[PDB]
Each structure stands twice: as C-alpha cells, then as structure tokens.
Amino acid sequence: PRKDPIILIPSAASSILTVANIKQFLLESKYVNPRNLPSVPNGLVNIEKNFERISRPIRFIIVDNTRMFTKPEYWDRVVAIFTTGHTWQFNNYQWNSPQELFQRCKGYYFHFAGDSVPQHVQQWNVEKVELDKNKRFKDVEVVRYFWHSLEKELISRGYR
C-alpha cells in the first residue's frame, strides 16, 4: 500500500488522547490534558514518522471523524483505531462490529493507571495502554513502545 495510512481517533469526554494532544504525545513524548490545548477545527492532524524498519518516511493522516471516507477504499488505509470505550463508536465504520473490525485493524485503548477498563472493552481485541495520571517519566517509553507496536502492524499490513 502506497497512499498515506490513516489513524482514527474520535473522542469522548473521557478520552485521554485526542487529535488535540496526539502530536505532542507521539512526537514529543509529552502528555498534556487535551482540554488545555487548542482545538483542531477540521479534526485532522498529520504526523510523519521515520521508522527504523521501513525505508521511506510514513505520513499519517490522523482524524477524529470519518468525513474523508468518500470511497470505501479509504477504509483499507486505516491502520490503527483509538477507542473511546463506546460501542457506538463503530456504527458508521465499514466494519461496524468490534470483532470484525479489530481482526483486521489494530485497536488501542488508552487509560490512566488506576481507572478500570469497562468489561466490554476488556473483551475487545485491542491493546490496553496505561498512562500515569500525575507522573510523566514513563511517557518516553510508552511512546517508544507505541511506535514499535504500530511499526510491527504496518510491516504486517505490507508497508515496506
């Protein structure tokens, strides 16, 4: 696949990662409360990543909505989905049940250490990732691990 891959990150009130704070997190390994940053009017951010195990840099389109999906083939480009924990998140997705969706797209569920994971989310085939509420010294490693996790997924989906 050669078009830019897509990461879906819609948000709910409880979301700890949204399009508003995802760049700071993934590029600077700096976690910031998303309500304390400028909103992103179009719900779209771009991030370029140079992976160790992929030759060319990869440019991600990271969106909080599915308005860009004007042809079904856009859905084939979705390589990761951040989940809010609401099952209604997927209602308008090409694959709208979590079982099918997370069999073919990598899912993540981020939450604060100490906060319980909803039972239905625990059952989903998504990777649960914890962040400290009040310490930030682990963030560098969490982000390194996230990128490694995503790199592995890209290689498996044929990105070279």
Distance of alpha carbon 145 from alpha carbon 143, whole angstroms: 5
Domain 1-160, CATH class in plain words: alpha beta
Question: Quick one: resolution in A?
Answer: 1.5
Q: How was this structure obtained?
A: X-ray
Q: Where are the domains of the chain?
A: 1-160
Distance of alpha carbon 19 from alpha carbon 70, whole angstroms: 21
- Determine contact, residues 19/45, Cβ cutoff 8 Å: yes
Long-range contacts of 138-143 (CB under 8 A, 24+ apart): 139/25, 139/29, 139/30, 139/31, 140/29, 142/29, 143/25, 143/26, 143/29
- Determine contact, residues 121/85, Cβ cutoff 8 Å: yes
For the chain, the straight-line distance linking the first and the last C-alpha, in angstroms and rounded, comes to: 9
